[PDB]
């Protein structure tokens, strides 16, 4: 799991939201009578009415990640 | 699982939304009588009513990611 | 997991939101009558109403996470 | 779990939020009747009605994070 | 975990948040009859109404977190 | 957890927030006939209404934090 | 208009009504460059959206009404 | 205009209304450029929601009502 | 306008409303740029989300009304 | 504009209201730029959220209005 | 213009109102640049967000109510 | 204008209001730039936000009003 970036050197961003009664769920574990639950996060769970990203990478940007479940 | 970008050198982005009782699910794991549940994330997860990426990348950018399950 | 960024060297960004009544959720583990529960967060959790992010990286960014599960 | 960022050298940001009566939940862990709970949150949890990141990274800037479960 | 950031030489940001009964929850552990319950917090909870983060890395930035559990 | 950062060398930031009746709740540990519970925090919790972090890192600044539970 | 009612002497009303966005207009008048509008009412307008006239007269009831419009 | 009403001696009612969003107009007169604009009411005007009427009459009732309109 | 009643001697009422953003008008009267504006109420104007009228005559009741418009 | 009312001699009333956000108007008289406004009330309005009349009349009761407009 | 009420001789009532942001308005006149405005009131005007009446009359009870408007 | 009301002779009452911002207006009269502005008022207004009204009339009771507006 490697990730590598690199950078070398020698308008309008309109977003308009108008709701009404606005319900997100982004991630959901829902049971009944269980035994057991895991809910594992390792990356990028982004939740909202207005989710916005402008202009996120303009440079060097590297995101390495992971996640394991062993059991056995 | 290698991830690699380099960069070298030597207008209007508009969006309108405009709802009425929105509901949004993303990622959802209901049961019922279970004996064991899993919500391995390790990616990206985006939910929104209004979910908008302008100009991410412009530079450098790598994303490495990795998920595993193992129960033997 | 090995992340890496590096730079060398040698407009309007507008978002509107206006809602009534948003109701968000963003990681929820629910359950009855369980008898082990694991809410394992190892990477990013952004939960809003307006979840804006601009010009989140325009130099030298790296993310490294890592995140495990053994129970044997 | 390894981060690294270096940076050598030799506009308007507008985010207009107005909501009514908003709930929001980052990270809930919800039941009944259980044996053991955990929460290991080891990442970034952000919670908020009006989340703005605006410019986050404009040096050098890296984050290693690493979390951990076992139980044998 | 190692975690580095080195930097080497030689506008307007507006957040405008007009809510009204904004209820928020950042990180909740709720349960009813458990026998043990852990809330193991070992990397960044940011909970607000109006929450902003504005030019957080301007230079040399950097953040190593580590979080275990181990029961056996 | 080793976290390090050098910086060698040889506008306007406005966030407003108008609220009514605001109710946060940052990290949360609500239960009934427990036998044991353990709130462990070790990174960074921060809770407001309005929660404004601007021009946090204009030097060298690093941050280590390290975090254990161990039973056996 | 002569109205006369005379009485000598010697089980389950349901309405059950669930709607969803309803727009009712009793009595309306819409124009556009006028000289002269006259809304004479004199009898018995009910508007609603649920109406319910249950066991209206079960004795002695009587209604006289006179509405007249002379213009000459 | 005459109106009489004599008596002389010698259950379940349900109404159930579940709406959301009723717009109700009941005795409207809309214009623009008039000269002059005359709204005379005499008789009876009910505007609900739930407008209900049970039971209005279990004895001597009467009801009279003139209304004039003279303009020469 | 001669209203009488005369009475000479020798259960469940149920009205259930659940509404949500009930909008009513009972008597209106909107222009723009007139002369002369009357609005005469002689009558009986009931306005409400929930108008209910139970019992309403169990005796002698008896109601005149008389309202005029002479202009000449 | 005579009325009268005699009476010789020789259970549950519910009313359930549960709203959320009621605007109401009774009596409007709305315009602009004119040279006469008149508001005439010679009746009864009543005007509520929650409008309810229960037993109004169970002896004797007589009511006797009247109204006039003359302008020659 | 008279009323009489004369009365010879020889339960549970429940309202139950629950609302949430009520805005009523009984009588209004709403204008701009007149040259004269008259609110002859002169009836039985009723305004409120729960206005009950209960039992009103149980014996003799009569109103008489007279309203001119002469201007020549 | 003559009321009269003589008698000769020879349970329970519950009103329930639970508001929140609760704002009544019973009689208002807005208006710019007038020459002359009348406000008779002579018969009754009853303006709240729990207006009740329990067993007024149990005897004898008449109420005469009269209200004129002459102008020449």
Same mark, same amino acid.
């Given at each position: &799991?490697?990730?590598? /970036? !690199? #950078? *070398? +050197?020698?308008?309008?961003?309109? =977003? @308009?939201?108008?709701?009404?009664? $606005? %319900?997100?769920?982004? &991630?959901?574990?829902? /049971? !009944? #009578? *269980? +035994?057991?639950?895991?809910?594992? =996060? @390792?990356?990028?769970?982004?939740? $909202? %009415? ?7 990478? !303009? ?8 996640? @394991?479940?062993?059991?056995?």
């Amino acid at each position: &799991v490697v990730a590598a /970036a !690199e #950078k *070398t +050197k020698q308008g309008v961003l309109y =977003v @308009g939201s108008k709701t009404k009664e $606005g %319900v997100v769920h982004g &991630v959901a574990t829902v /049971a !009944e #009578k *269980t +035994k057991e639950q895991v809910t594992n =996060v @390792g990356g990028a769970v982004v939740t $909202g %009415v207005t989710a916005v990203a402008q202009k996120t990478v !303009e440079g060097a940007g590297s995101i390495a990640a992971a996640t @394991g479940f062993v059991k056995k």
